[PDB]
């Protein structure tokens with residue numbers, strides 16, 4: 001129940017292009033690389049020869065393909081996909097030894113969806129039915145997986161920060177992927193992986209904001225987002241505090257707003273000048289919280305694709321949000337994250353693969369006594 005050597009290192013990717021798992025669709029099996037995405041609920045795959053695609057789902061080749069005779073148009077704030085809904089046989093070669101009949105959205109037109117130069121051709125939406133397109137009757141993949149097999153209602157993600165990697169442990173926890181203890185936060189509601197942030201610290205210095213701001217209008221765990229995204233006010237106070245803590249060196253305003261990169265000579269990054277960032281999360285027990293702490297090496301992420309610079313260039317990967325807090329790859333790269341769906345909870349433990357230096361490490365610590373944690377949730 002605690003060692004899944006088969007599924008260790010089943011995630012690949014490129015920096016800033018996300019984390020993908022190999023998947024097969026149809027009979028005979030068609031291999032596809034699929035973005036692992038805890039911030040959506042559709043299993044959506046390229047099904048037409050978009051020029052950026054390495055491969056695509058060819059329904060005509062699958063004898064087990066069934067048509068639901070229903071389309072879906074999915075817009076985002078920037079970009080879209082449109083698909084045809086059907087079902088087919090789906091398996092995960094480096095996952096559990098099973099085959100599932102799952103909903104597939106066959107992507108027939110898209111815009112700013114696929115990444116030019118990326119090595120994935122679809123998205124595996126791991127969140128719940130409530131946010132599935134077009135509605136909650138379109139059963140997400142993981143629900144079908146759990147319903148149809150004896151795979152436990154749990155998956156865990158170790159996201160390791162040009163090549164990235166890690167593990168998606170399907171049906172369990174691999175103890176070699178973390179150090180110390182897992183600490184669990186409740187899933188507030190089963191739509192996104194919603195959580196409640198209870199306290200925020202920059203280098204141990206509390207932001208002293210009304211904790212309702214931290215979760216305005218929600219906080220989510222999202223492997224499909226690069227940044228730690230913060231509500232506008234929280235971002236402002238956080239940046240003011242990060243500025244103060246790092247005032248040893250001055251940086252342009254546009255860097256903090258993600259409008260410019262900032263570059264240093266190779267190996268000459270002042271990591272120690274930048275603060276740690278701590279998020280206190282609601283614990284399992286009344287008045288009990290725990291704290292997750294990330295490093296500058298999580299939120300100041302390298303931009304390798306700069307043709308106009310011979311130096312080491314970085315993006316400030318904490319940005320403002322109007323959809324609430326998004327604990328993206330910036331958070332998740334620090335931690336082994338257990339999506340304990342059976343128990344409506346998310347476990348955090350320090351990642352065995354997280355990027356750190358000789359002085360500071362990412363941390364998961366508790367218990368702490370935090371009162372009025374329920375007031376932090378926005379209604």
Ligand SMILES: C[C@H]1SC(N)=N[C@](C)(c2cc(NC(=O)c3cnc(OCF)cn3)ccc2F)[C@H]1F
Pocket residue numbers: 013014015016017018019037038039040076077113115123222223224225226329
């Ligand atoms: C608005 C988005 S947010 C979300 N969770 N999921 C959706 C389906 C979505 C996500 C993405 N992700 C990425 O490209 C990406 C890149 N780098 C990452 O980490 C560092 F490597 C993580 N993810 C691409 C297209 C998408 F459509 C959309 F809903």
